[PDB]
Symmetry: C4
Subunit: 386 residues, 4 copies
């Protein structure tokens, strides 16, 4: 009835610091806070509220169960969120469902949540709409089934969420599929084509009505991100590697043009989830990317400036816009979301900060498209031994 | 005006792990949480929210009053709940009324709460609707008056809650009655017939408009659960023992057919509240049951697959569907609830986990009907000496 | 527009235990809770929610400022409340305004709050409506200005709150006035007549449309409570002493008839706020009273049964209905409130329990009109040295 | 659609104690609370709720990060608020955006938030409306960009917020500008005229429809506050110094008339944000001011009585109304806000109290226009070493 449709983005040229959800700063052995242990934070917004989602380990930052929370998958993993702006404490967190992998988005009416939970070789995808469980999808490759770990994209009520299934190591194949949900019910599945061989942890944004574009991870063959062009009328997802000389993954080789756009050329396997933002304008879209600062290590964070060429076939270099996190500060996964205002959408990037001692926590820094001003780089301010 | 009526259930063949309300995992002597001490958790849902209900002891998990909270009845017992997904902490819990036994349900308009509180030989049932106390019912057998300890069933505004009163030991008689409430006011009382001799801790689900079916406990004569068929037009509750060779109580004898359906045959007295779910379909209902894993002890938990025969007179064995809790993990009471979605209902089972040191707490695991996938068995993850 | 008017009470013959807001049971030096230090708790209800109000000392139960919280008046006193059913913790409490004396009620549209704050010889009454400060009233006798410390009574939008001002010791005069507020604005002041000499801490309930009756304290001359009959059309408050042989204050002499209804006869000064409930029926009102158990000390608590004679001029004894608190448990102030349901009102009594070590706290027990059942007496369960 | 417009103020002659948001009184090394470290608190109100805003340091009152929170600007600074009446704890606080300087107000529909964040020589102003980031404004003088640190004024949807940029020391120039926002979008900028040389930390109140008046700080040349008269139709802000002999800043010289109204005459640089309230009446406006008690030090707090002459050119002395904080209690910044009731507005002053040990916190005392009664002076009651 009132389903959200993408709008043109508002005026701005830089992604300026907006909010820091540095949850594990009100905890520590010398403090009084009770904070969730989690990984892979992301933000999704409705037109009235933004929420900060994460996968927790059902344990406090400084508690008897904090050991063992560095695991990627466990039966204690759950998807939970708070409103953006809340400290992300145990009392403020709302658990949506169990799951060691997941995503969430809002269609303009109600929140849709997607998680993956189960045994590694046979995990199940479950979808929930409005606190009522709606649907499920079974593992298709016989390997760890994974989601975006970021916001899913809703177009007039149809929400497109990426799922993948396959071996994430060298020599593996991980062909992604996009589930199309309406009110949490899976109505369609769009399989990939093009360089479908390995698509993982896709960060997606709308490129206008009827079209979605994603920038994904490749953890086995290259260090150039796959770009997935989803045509929702043709019902096809065309995957290919960025032909740009600027490499967006971590580890990565020195920037250079590929000999051919879809040839595997890089440092080998491994990778990090990255950011991807689209600034939609009446005269064409501009694309922005996040990259770690130091090549070969998840240190620092840069924003690569507007690309006016197709992210797949442009072949031009992507200029540096700003350095948002210095190389003295460790970083993790990067994602993106859009605020949905009264008149326009506002692209924002989310930068993960990883902190550990005898437990592992995540902190997030949100940078939103705004006006031109000198960058004020952010240090998480979390001391694992505080 | 907008009273809820049962709907057909959605597609699914397995009860897959959904959410674990393992409240006493953010507490412990080494943590900073303040968590209620409680027993007999259950979940009830509205179409917009699900709530997790429990009977507390007005004490924290690790506090000066934690001793003595293993009692079944005390004047400090109270009925309280949080939204499903909340940690069930002291600050999130809302107390509804005092009571050492109780149930709750939502009729599509507002929440109805039922508790029993008073002296053992002369306890009083009280009903509340929408935070306003509405009605009461007095003890009828001169013994401990008890409720379902699970969700009550509302049919177009009329909510059916089980109450029982009698000696729970060997040689006792405990004849149940069903109170029919409308807006919390008791409008009718349906007495039982058939094997009315001992009916306790009934887990009820609708079997369609105008009909409710319950699977109850028998703690004195047998190890086969009583099944109560409630005809809301005829205003009769027909009770009889499951004629199936599969015995659902704990302790229980090895599975075997009874010599006659309502003959008392088993290991003697004792028992546990069990689960009972109905999958309503246009071509007939399917019934699902929970059972402990190890016969003679409350260890593990199994889900017994669809029974297409009448739960009372079928006489066929009920196949094993899944083992949801391994026998290395202790379990307690089992119950069931239904989520009420936009298009359909979703049957879910709730499995209690009991943990104690110098206090006693309960944790709950929720398994909801979903798609076919390998089972991922759950270990509560609560260390009484954490 | 939707202002509340009194309704007939529902069926019942006993005030049965309903809820215990024993806030200082989740605190203590061995616990993790942060609970307000307060005195004189009372409950007021809207048709959708009940709230528990108290005057706090802006300090935690076990904190660096807990010393000195036994004071009756200080600049750190504030009026705050939580929803009835909440633990009344620091995080759940909402502060309404500063004040060392106060009352609150709901008119069917929004909450009206009244407090007294200022210097003893020249304190100010302030009224607030809907979080916006509306009006004030200045001290009139040059002595400590006081309120009811209980729910104010709203009749079709006009809310009647008692204020008094005078010396509370022997030989003093404390003539009460009733402020009539509409949307928090003081529209009228009704002065008292009859035995106006000393009226304090009035517990008021409606006796039907256009009429309010209160049972007050007399802390200087007698041990019989003043009864105030407020005629809202005549705009008069007629005060006189209960002519009944049953004495409701503490300390009190042995029950005996007075030689004349308004002659000062008793144990001298001192007193306690008491309960007063009205069961409105089509054939006349019934009155119920609370009394301490042990005469001469605030120990235990009794409910004195229905009085069908005018509370002022009846002259008959008031029979004992139930003993609600045993004499092994210390008690404090008693008050009353009414729940406002869909069809009827439900009179309820609130019994204060006082606990102290190096701080002073209050706990409250709520007993609501319900069916006939044996009484289950309540022990606060709060250990000052827990 | 429903945008707020100023109303006439209600009856009253004194600003009487209303509420004390003494947040750091439920914390301390001996307590269990987790309270934000912050500075420059202020209150802004909607017609349904009042909120207490502050700039935090993302640290608890008694935690591992409490050192270093006495800084005026840092990357850990954020704007957050709670409802007025809440303890302002970590769990109740909602973070709106990052920022080391800011303001907030409500236009009758939704909350507008303004902050300044960035590097000192090139900071950015950002505006947010309804949890969605809307606009920004860049530094204009090449120096620290600052906001009011108090409520912004909304007239029929147009919200007027003061920003300034310049050197705050001796010999500096700090010319203010007023941004006019509608739904968070900056629609106009009104530059100042008159004694535009140094305008800072303006406390603004409406003087009627189409007009706003502010009393500002001057931290370099004088100890008389600048008054800014904003004509929203002429779109001009006329700045000049108070010609009154009563000096409102701190430090200040002994009261005396200036030789000429806009001649710099005082004790030199330095200053404190002060209060400014307007009582709008059909026969003209009255102005009220706050002043510290002890000249030359931020000790105590006085309210200077109604000024019926133009605050700029009156030249008469402003009589003392009340002493609201004694000189035994240290004070900080003062501001003002208006409650928006059903029929009228209610001017209120907010008095900051500064407390520090190894951390710095702020407490606030709210005094609202009410009736005539003897003043009850307030001592914060916060012990830095509690
Ligand atoms: C999508 O379509 C809507 C109208 O249905 C329009 O208002 C909006 O601007 C469009 N967005 C884009 C990005 O084209
Ligand atoms: C109950 O009746 C309603 C119509 O009143 C119908 O929509 C619903 O499907 C029925 N449910 C069952 C289980 O028969
Ligand atoms: C008060 O008047 C209303 C009608 O205005 C009526 O419904 C209600 O029952 C009356 N209450 C009493 C106690 O007479
Ligand atoms: C402002 O104008 C409105 C009508 O638009 C009026 O009701 C209000 O009283 C005016 N306020 C002042 C202060 O003049």
């Amino acid at each position: 009835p009132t389903y959200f449709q993408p709008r043109m983005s508002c005026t701005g040229t830089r992604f300026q610091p907006f909010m820091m959800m540095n949850s594990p700063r009100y905890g520590g052995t010398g403090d009084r806070g009770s904070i969730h242990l989690n990984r892979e934070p992301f933000v999704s917004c409705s037109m009235n509220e933004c929420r900060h989602f994460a996968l927790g380990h059902t344990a406090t930052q400084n508690g008897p169960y904090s050991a063992g929370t560095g695991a990627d998958r466990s039966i204690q993993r759950m998807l939970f969120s708070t409103k953006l702006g809340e400290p992300f404490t145990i009392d403020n967190a709302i658990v949506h469902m169990s799951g060691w992998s997941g995503s969430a988005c809002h269609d303009g009416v109600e929140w849709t949540y997607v998680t993956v939970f189960g045994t590694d070789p046979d995990a199940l995808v479950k979808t929930k709409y409005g606190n009522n469980l709606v649907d499920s999808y079974r593992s298709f490759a016989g390997n760890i089934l994974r989601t975006q770990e970021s916001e899913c994209v809703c177009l007039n009520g149809s929400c497109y969420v990426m799922i993948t299934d396959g071996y994430a190591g060298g020599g593996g194949v991980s062909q992604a599929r996009f589930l199309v949900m309406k009110q949490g019910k899976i109505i369609d599945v769009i399989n990939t084509s093009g360089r479908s061989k390995f698509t993982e942890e896709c960060t997606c944004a709308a490129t206008g009505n009827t079209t979605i574009m994603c920038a994904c991870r490749d953890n086995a063959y290259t260090d150039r991100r796959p770009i997935v062009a989803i045509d929702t009328i043709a019902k096809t997802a065309n995957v290919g590697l960025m032909c740009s000389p600027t490499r967006m993954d971590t580890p990565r080789s020195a920037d250079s043009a590929p000999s051919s756009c879809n040839v595997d050329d890089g440092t080998g396997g491994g990778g990090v989830k990255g950011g991807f933002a689209v600034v939609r304008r009446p005269n064409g879209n501009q694309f922005y990317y996040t990259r770690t600062g130091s090549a070969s290590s998840r240190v620092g964070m840069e924003v690569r400036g507007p690309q006016t060429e197709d992210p797949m076939t442009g072949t031009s270099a992507i200029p540096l816009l700003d350095i948002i996190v210095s190389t003295s500060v460790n970083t993790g996964y990067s994602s993106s979301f859009e605020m949905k205002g009264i008149e326009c959408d506002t692209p924002c990037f989310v930068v993960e900060h990883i902190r550990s001692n005898t437990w592992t926590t995540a902190s997030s820094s949100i940078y939103c498209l705004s006006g031109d001003a000198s960058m004020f780089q952010f240090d998480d301010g979390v001391n694992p031994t505080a």
